[PDB]
Design a protein around this ligand. Structure first.
Ligand code: SF4
Ligand code: SF4
Ligand code: FES
Ligand code: FES
Ligand SMILES: [Fe+2]
Ligand SMILES: [Fe+2]
Lengths: 633, 633
């Protein structure tokens, strides 16, 4: 099972699933081999009913689409649609939060409120919304309105791009026409321009893609901003991760999907229902996280993470998962069928994300507590049905220190320099104790032994004194392998990095270092990394494409990860992707994305499937940036 | 060549292209055979980087997507994305027109103006915008603002749906949650819900699709409304069609794409530049139409139609096409390469629709006349370069009577009944002189011998006294085969239909009948057919799903045609499609689209590749509606 996942808890559940004849994502992958080489290389088009069209990567006909679409057009159009789809996810998430905030302050959803007033005011200031002599509720109404306004054309561009990147960066992007006019506007324009008989120039198409990726960034940043206002800005918290956080004697409830609007209420209501759970013979309700919504409640509340991404089915295979509460995104629909074998109650809650065979309980912010109780009572009923049934919860978990929002990081650093908190970080970049910064982001992918790329690359970078930050299922991988436990600093970290982590930790009263990797939160919270990097850029008076900062979507899967990778490139970062996106069928497109885009945005993709090699390439990128700043490396 | 196109002019140019070694759309199709059976049936998914996934239509593994996505999910998700892409095209078009109207009335684009004041006022009234004591420019500003507001969420649903369908229809749709909240909002929501690990219930997905198809309808109706305000509501006009409208001794300029914002100015400026053209040795500038933008200028100005859809390259093969002026949609990018062989200057004009190797001349409404002159001077230069070069323009053309907007149809009928103009039409439906109404819409498709389905089906329906109306390349097919020439009424029409066409024509002073088929305009002008059918519904006091009205996308190709077909079904029409959409890989999805959707909207798809059989099925659908109204059939 080591060939499927490097996580021992997952391996144990794979053996259980095999024994019990429960088909998994890895079995469905094996059944799909060999996969279509046209799709793999991007050389397939189904954008009209004359198709499907394909182009042989090499050899003879077909060489061109029926309408005349070249390999470079077909590849660029497919990629653009993936970016649009990612943008649609992150911005749908953000939109949901914007409506929730509006309802909350209009008195229509009393389960929700302004929890972080400071964040609300700072966001208002950043957007140009006056706060002086204004009621919080009115300020919040204006912020929510501004959020919703960024989805469409208006007299200003997307403020959740133009107000979050340094002016010099916005100028570079504006010069190339890359600043989005409206989030849903760009999504629609991509779908239009990539439809049959429209845009048919690879560079033009890809520029469109870069712009749509910034619409995605805006959705991410908006999602983080709004979630922080509503639910609180994360601060350092200690919890645990992996399947061992499940408890046989508790009602185990996984929150899974993305939106904290749902999970955050589940967490609070579950505490209120402890006595009901105990009435049913349980110790209480044990809420655990899967995927991003698990990350959201881990970051804010220390809710333990059960599992992530590709291994999500394994939580169910334990036999102890009484409910899986879903909103949207990254949920393998197999869970609905597996639930019939495992006893788990899978519950959908959002109108646009249902799964055949799952129970649907409409969630309305207006009735959030009521709807949460209904859902949790289904979970309690399910716990009762497994009375006396043996379960197999792998006794495997790690300690996780998390909650490193950008505010939290700035605060931690401020203990070393109160009025110039970024300076200690920059000092240590300059003196070589910190070589650079690497953001690990995005998914696991069944094609890559689970977590192998994240851990292999992280290990090499940490030994080379790279400050590693992580989000989403990248943070999931690293947390499950001990990278968020400060007890592992001596083993994992180079002497320089150790010194800095220790110095910061001891100044924050820890008697010990920060963890080896800083968990910056969910996938939308990649926007937090942007806030940190942009703040460093502003402090240094240089653009992001001069900073020794890189990203790695080491095991990418979702269209959202493609969008994130693309905006990482667009804002100026060397951006590693550890799975093949469908671009290799066009050398010109590949060359643009991995090379000539450097001349446009300063960022570039690094496509590298071998993780040792990827680490070397990321180190080379970091060191090139160091040299560019006149620093030793 | 009869196996490729039933159009003799096209056949002649195919022989020329063969002789000269110029590859065509038919050659690229042959080179693509056999096409992928997974794509053909819809059983392929590339929505994440674990893919490509496929499902064998029959047999053994693979049976399910890697994430657990079933055949019914994969098929529904692919279809939904096609609908969104169509919606994005039609609504991008509409949005462009809305911005143009706004600029025009704000004094920023003096080449544009309110040409149809009556239409402006009627639209304002329909939207609830007060006109009483208001300046036209202010009314137009409010209409343009309303248009742009329909793209996003607001306190009202999409008004270009809710104000254009009868209340009873809106109620049925609202009950099923199918009324769009915002055009780009729905497009984005589709892309989100169809992304990995989101919506995974076929019915839920398809309901989303129906709603997004209404966003497309809104974009179409908005496009027609705005184009009519700006450029004039069509009225009956006589012109010609087919390659014989090209003139060797003239500067031949094709307008190609969709948006009249561009073509309409080309037409007016070309008249102003006659003397310059004559200075260059030409007789003048001969503007001719291809595809929808050709339909727009044919409908308003009687500009002759050169060709349509699948045969667009053949205009170039003549050697006499000096320029092809492009905006977006349905342009085979092969034209840019073919231009190098034929001498034609291919000019793109829109930032989001470029073609490698074509000349790009940015068009800005603010400088429309200037930009038009620049473009037409390139065409004149090109005419000069072919001095003394033989050309082969097939001497083949038909007479075309067109310009049947819904206003024009109502006016024509009003000559038989001034104060109840729809009544004469309804009278003849009731007495059997008109069996029903069929709308032919959409594209040609290289898979179907060009025009064969449109003409075969139209011939059968006309003999059975069906009133046939047509738009887009359906109108193109029928016009090129003589179906818009009143001289062909005796040959084509049943006695009942002939009687009615003759009665209406003679009351309008023609000394002769209306044409066999009524040309209702471009693809967005399918919205005109909706206006007519909705007006008939209102007059009768019944919903559209009780009317003997059907649609046929007989040779469909573009994602836009899929969207149009889908909203035809959603508003309550039996809707024939004459090519296989990628749905046959899921019986449940097929059953929903062809059968159970009847219970939701009253409309349904009729998938039928054999045109004789399709005609029988359409007649059966019409007759079933007749019987439902208690009428003989
Ligand atoms: S858009 Fe072009 S390449 Fe794509 S399916 Fe249609 S004909 Fe083929
Ligand atoms: S979304 Fe599911 S079916 Fe589609 S490519 Fe990804 S794993 Fe395969
Ligand atoms: S030919 Fe396999 S992805 Fe289309
Ligand atoms: S396997 Fe051919 S369309 Fe994907
Ligand atoms: Fe996520
Ligand atoms: Fe069209």
């Amino acid at each position: 099972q080591n060939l499927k996942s490097t996580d021992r808890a997952v391996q144990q559940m794979l053996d259980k699933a095999k024994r019990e004849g429960i088909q998994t994502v890895w079995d469905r992958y094996e059944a799909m081999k060999p996969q279509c080489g046209f799709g793999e290389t991007g050389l397939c088009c189904r954008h009209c009913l004359q198709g499907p069209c394909r182009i042989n990567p090499f050899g003879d006909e077909p060489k061109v689409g029926i309408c005349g679409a070249t390999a470079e057009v077909i590849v660029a159009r497919g990629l653009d649609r993936s970016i649009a789809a990612g943008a649609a996810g992150h911005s749908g998430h953000a939109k949901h939060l914007a409506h929730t905030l509006k309802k909350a302050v209009q008195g229509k959803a009393a389960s929700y409120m302004i929890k972080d007033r400071t964040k609300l005011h700072s966001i208002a200031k950043r957007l140009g919304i006056p706060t002086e002599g204004q009621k919080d509720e009115d300020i919040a109404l204006e912020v929510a309105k501004a959020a919703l306004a960024d989805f469409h054309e208006k007299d200003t561009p997307v403020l959740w791009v133009t107000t979050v990147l340094p002016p010099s960066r916005v100028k570079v992007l504006s010069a190339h026409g890359l600043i989005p006019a409206g989030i849903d506007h760009e999504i629609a324009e991509i779908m239009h321009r990539t439809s049959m008989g429209c845009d048919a120039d690879a560079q033009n198409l890809l520029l469109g893609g870069l712009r749509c990726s910034l619409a995605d960034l805006a959705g991410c940043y908006m999602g983080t901003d709004l979630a922080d206002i509503l639910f609180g800005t994360p601060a350092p918290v200690v919890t645990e991760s992996n399947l061992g956080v499940l408890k046989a004697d508790a009602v185990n409830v996984a929150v899974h999907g993305h939106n904290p609007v749902l999970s955050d209420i589940i967490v609070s209501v579950s505490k209120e229902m402890e006595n009901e759970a105990r009435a049913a013979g349980a110790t209480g309700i044990n809420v655990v996280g899967i995927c991003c919504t698990g990350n959201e409640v881990l970051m804010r509340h220390g809710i333990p993470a059960c599992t992530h991404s590709v291994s999500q089915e394994m939580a169910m295979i334990t036999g102890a998962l009484d409910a899986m509460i879903l909103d949207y995104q990254c949920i393998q629909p197999s869970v609905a069928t597996i639930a019939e074998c495992t006893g788990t109650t899978v519950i959908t809650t959002m109108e646009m994300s249902k799964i055949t065979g799952a129970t649907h309980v409409n969630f309305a912010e207006e009735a959030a507590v009521e709807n949460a109780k209904q859902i949790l009572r289904l979970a309690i009923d399910t716990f009762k049905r497994r009375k006396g049934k043996p379960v197999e919860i792998p006794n495997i978990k790690t300690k996780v220190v998390a909650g490193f929002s950008t505010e939290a990081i700035i605060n931690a650093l401020s203990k070393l320099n109160a009025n110039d908190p970024l300076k200690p970080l920059i000092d240590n970049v300059v003196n070589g104790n910190i070589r650079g910064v690497c953001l690990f982001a995005g998914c696991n992918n069944v094609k890559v032994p689970q977590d192998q790329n994240f851990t292999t690359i992280a290990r090499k970078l940490l030994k080379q004194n790279v400050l590693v930050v992580a989000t989403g299922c990248g943070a999931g991988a690293l947390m499950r392998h001990g990278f968020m436990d400060p007890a592992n600093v001596d083993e994992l970290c180079g002497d320089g990095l150790k010194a800095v982590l220790t110095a910061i930790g001891e100044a924050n009263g820890l008697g010990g270092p920060l963890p080896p990797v800083l968990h910056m939160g969910s996938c939308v919270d990649n926007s937090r990394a942007v806030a940190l990097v942009a703040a460093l850029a502003n402090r240094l008076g240089v653009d992001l494409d001069r900073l020794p900062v890189v990203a790695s979507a080491a095991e990418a899967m979702h269209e959202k990860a493609v969008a994130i990778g693309t905006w990482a490139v667009t804002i100026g970062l060397p951006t590693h992707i550890g799975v093949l996106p469908p671009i290799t069928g066009s050398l010109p497109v590949t060359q643009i994305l991995t090379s000539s885009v450097k001349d446009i945005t300063g960022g570039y993709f690094i496509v590298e499937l071998d993780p040792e090699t990827a680490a070397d390439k990321l180190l080379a990128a970091i060191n090139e940036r160091r040299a560019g700043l006149g620093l030793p490396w």
